[PDB]
Amino acid sequence: SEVAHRFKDLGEENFKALVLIAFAQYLQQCPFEDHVKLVNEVTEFAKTCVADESAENCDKSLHTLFGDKLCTVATLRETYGEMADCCAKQEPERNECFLQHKDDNPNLPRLVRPEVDVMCTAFHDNEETFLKKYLYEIARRHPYFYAPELLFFAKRYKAAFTECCQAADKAACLLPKLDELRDEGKASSAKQRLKCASLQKFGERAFKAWAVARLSQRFPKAEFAEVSKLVTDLTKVHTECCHGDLLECADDRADLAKYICENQDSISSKLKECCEKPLLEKSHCIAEVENDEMPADLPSLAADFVESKDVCKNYAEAKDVFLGMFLYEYARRHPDYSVVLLLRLAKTYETTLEKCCAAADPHECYAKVFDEFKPLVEEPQNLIKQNCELFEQLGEYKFQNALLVRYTKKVPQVSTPTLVEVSRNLGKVGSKCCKHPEAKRMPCAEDYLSVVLNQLCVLHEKTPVSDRVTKCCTESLVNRRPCFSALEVDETYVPKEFNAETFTFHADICTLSEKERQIKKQTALVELVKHKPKATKEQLKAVMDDFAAFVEKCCKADDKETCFAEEGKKLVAASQAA
């Protein structure tokens, strides 16, 4: 009985909660009230199996069980359309299908939060339904959210309400909290999508190279045998979470947090503090702790990898073991390199041994490897340096604007919603990393960038429109940023004259937040570029400022919606002329 074993391992509580997330990530357009019953039904089942492993269907694979239930409601296409065909199939082709349909940008109502009073009440009336509703939405909206981590945010989102609802000034206690979780969930979300993308599009070897270089930077004191085992289990944890096996993905992520802690001394010292915390906080901590200190006396790399006359011999026997070794070593000494930079050097190295380990004399041709690493190391350091400066000058909002134009000119074929989302996020690299010593910037930076880019890649992949995007995204995971950074203004671009309406801002813009308002301004910026790419100097940065004026002005003209529309009509003529 697997659901019984799993049920035992996680406790009714988290079992039940994880079940809701699996379903809600498989069937996103499905109603909460429905997901609630199905989970209730699966939960009621689980229990009979705990009381008797020999019961009726207690021997089924979780997917079999989990899919028949999902299908008691998926088989209706006048509501769910395409999803019905997976229910036509069987495990494992059916689960395989389900995953194949997870929507990255569902056509879902934008979630708005009710007043603080409204919320705090609901919260007291029934905290369970209140939090169920949360897990539900966060999950239907972010189909690849790391199941285990979601249970953590859940915990944190609960205490916000508990604490803040007793507080004297509820709204002031709370608001900033819901703002922190919302903000930090998105980042989590994005980060995991990248782990699944790895696995799924590029495969396990890809992911392993990442986990090797990553753990190694974080645990430079840990042995390879050690770091290797962690890399194996970390890989199983994300495989399961990314291929829909969420209960066991949590069960295993627990075990790892336990092992790590149990073998604390041999991994890292910065761990002490996480290993005393409650299970969900211990895995989050461990998952996000800082890098340990580097060993006092570590050799010179060149010795075993470029000087040793038995490098090719060693590389040939077990390449992947020897190659992990290089990365592990190379990584541990440079926590100032982006992980993708690291993997780029491993890849240079690998191919460098393929070529050299067959040439007559091997020693003389690979003797130059680190010489090849060099240009690979400058470019990124020079790009973060360049984009940080621009940041201190323009400030965030404007910076994003510059990146919008930059990326819009680059990949014009792309949906506006997207260019506005990805570019605002690309933009956010400035406030995240430029506040670090020239040492910490590259790992913070480039990696941030990759997580942003993989966001595009998946939003674009849905509805593919530009080939250069598909190219840069499919060509190799490790070279995306360099790829996009390299692209230049698409001259093939066939613009769209000028829309009469899409530049008519409406009075209600005055009631939205200053965040959204920038998103409205920015969206039109994007549209601008998509009509006049050819010549767009500072002049653009100038036409944008009018609209900001136009809004600030017309939002306070005591008009009858008049000047908002009527000024717009004159100003759209002003922008078309210029």
- In-domain check, residue 573: no
Q: Of 490, 517, 549, which residue is a domain's last?
A: 490
Do 3 and 49 touch, CB atoms closer than 8 A? yes
Angle between helices 224-242 and 319-333 (to 10 degrees): 100
Q: How far apart are the first and last CA of the chain?
A: 72
Identity at 274, one-letter amino acid code: C
Q: DSSP letter at 436?
A: S
Q: Which residue has the tokens 């621009």?
A: 390
d(CA 220, CA 245): 31
Judge whether 103 is annotated as a binding position: no
- In-domain check, residue 577: no
d(CA 285, CA 274): 5
d(CA 255, CA 511): 49
Judge whether 467 is annotated as a binding position: no
- The residue segments making up the domain with residue 327 are 293-378
Judge whether 248 is annotated as a binding position: yes
- Verify that 410 and 479 share a domain, yes or no: yes
Cα–Cα separations (whole angstroms), residue 196 to 202, 434, 454 = 9, 28, 11
Q: Of 378, 395, 425, which residue is a domain's last?
A: 378
- Verify that 84 and 53 share a domain, yes or no: yes
**Backbone phi, then psi, for 336, in 5-degree steps?**
-95, 0
Using alpha carbons, select from 34, 26, 35 the residue that is nearest to residue 101: 26
Kindly tell me the sign of the dihedral angle through the C-alpha atoms of 92, 97, 100, 101. negative
Do 267 and 241 touch, CB atoms closer than 8 A? no
Q: Which residue has the tokens 């190279």?
A: 209
Identity at 103, one-letter amino acid code: D
- Verify that 125 and 187 share a domain, yes or no: yes
CATH of the domain at 22: 1.10.246.10
- Residue 122 corresponds to which tokens in the numbers above? 């609901």
- Verify that 549 and 450 share a domain, yes or no: no
- Residue 119 corresponds to which tokens in the numbers above? 């919320």
- Verify that 97 and 2 share a domain, yes or no: yes
- Residue 527 corresponds to which tokens in the numbers above? 């549209």
- In-domain check, residue 225: yes
- Verify that 466 and 540 share a domain, yes or no: no
Helix (H, G, I), strand (E, B) or coil at 411: coil
- In-domain check, residue 575: no
Do 460 and 473 touch, CB atoms closer than 8 A? yes
- In-domain check, residue 222: yes
Judge whether 240 is annotated as a binding position: yes
Do 271 and 264 touch, CB atoms closer than 8 A? yes
- Verify that 230 and 326 share a domain, yes or no: no
Residues 93-99: contacts with CB under 8 Å, at least 24 apart: 94/63, 94/67, 95/63, 95/67, 95/243, 95/244, 98/26, 98/67, 98/70, 98/244, 99/243, 99/244
DSSP structure string for 34-48: HHHHHHHHHHHHHHH
State the Cα torsion 23-26-31-35 to the nearest 10°: -10
Cα–Cα separations (whole angstroms), residue 140 to 66, 197, 470 = 17, 18, 26
Q: Which residue has the tokens 């819009």?
A: 408
Judge whether 104 is annotated as a binding position: no
DSSP structure string for 485-537: HH----TT-------SSTT---GGGGGS-HHHHHHHHHHHHHHHHTT--SS-S
- Verify that 10 and 74 share a domain, yes or no: yes
Q: Indicate the burial class of 559 (C-beta count within 10 angstroms; 0-12, 13-18, 19 or more).
A: middle
Residues 6+ apart with CB under 8 A from 460: 414, 415, 418, 466, 469, 470, 473
d(CA 564, CA 20): 46
Judge whether 378 is annotated as a binding position: no
Kindly tell me the sign of the dihedral angle through the C-alpha atoms of 98, 103, 107, 112. positive
- Verify that 447 and 367 share a domain, yes or no: no
Question: How many angstroms is the resolution?
Answer: 2.5
- Verify that 30 and 122 share a domain, yes or no: no
Q: Of 433, 459, 490, which residue is a domain's last?
A: 490
Using alpha carbons, select from 28, 16, 19 the residue that is nearest to residue 98: 28
Judge whether 361 is annotated as a binding position: no
- Verify that 383 and 484 share a domain, yes or no: yes
d(CA 338, CA 342): 6
Using alpha carbons, select from 539, 537, 548 the residue that is nearest to residue 571: 548
Do 466 and 413 touch, CB atoms closer than 8 A? yes
Judge whether 255 is annotated as a binding position: yes
- In-domain check, residue 19: yes
Identity at 155, one-letter amino acid code: K
Do 242 and 196 touch, CB atoms closer than 8 A? yes
Judge whether 13 is annotated as a binding position: no
Judge whether 265 is annotated as a binding position: no
Neighbours of 544 (CB within 10 A): 20
- Verify that 332 and 231 share a domain, yes or no: no
- In-domain check, residue 93: yes
State the Cα torsion 540-544-545-547 to the nearest 10°: 150
- In-domain check, residue 576: no
Total tally of structural domains belonging to the chain:
6
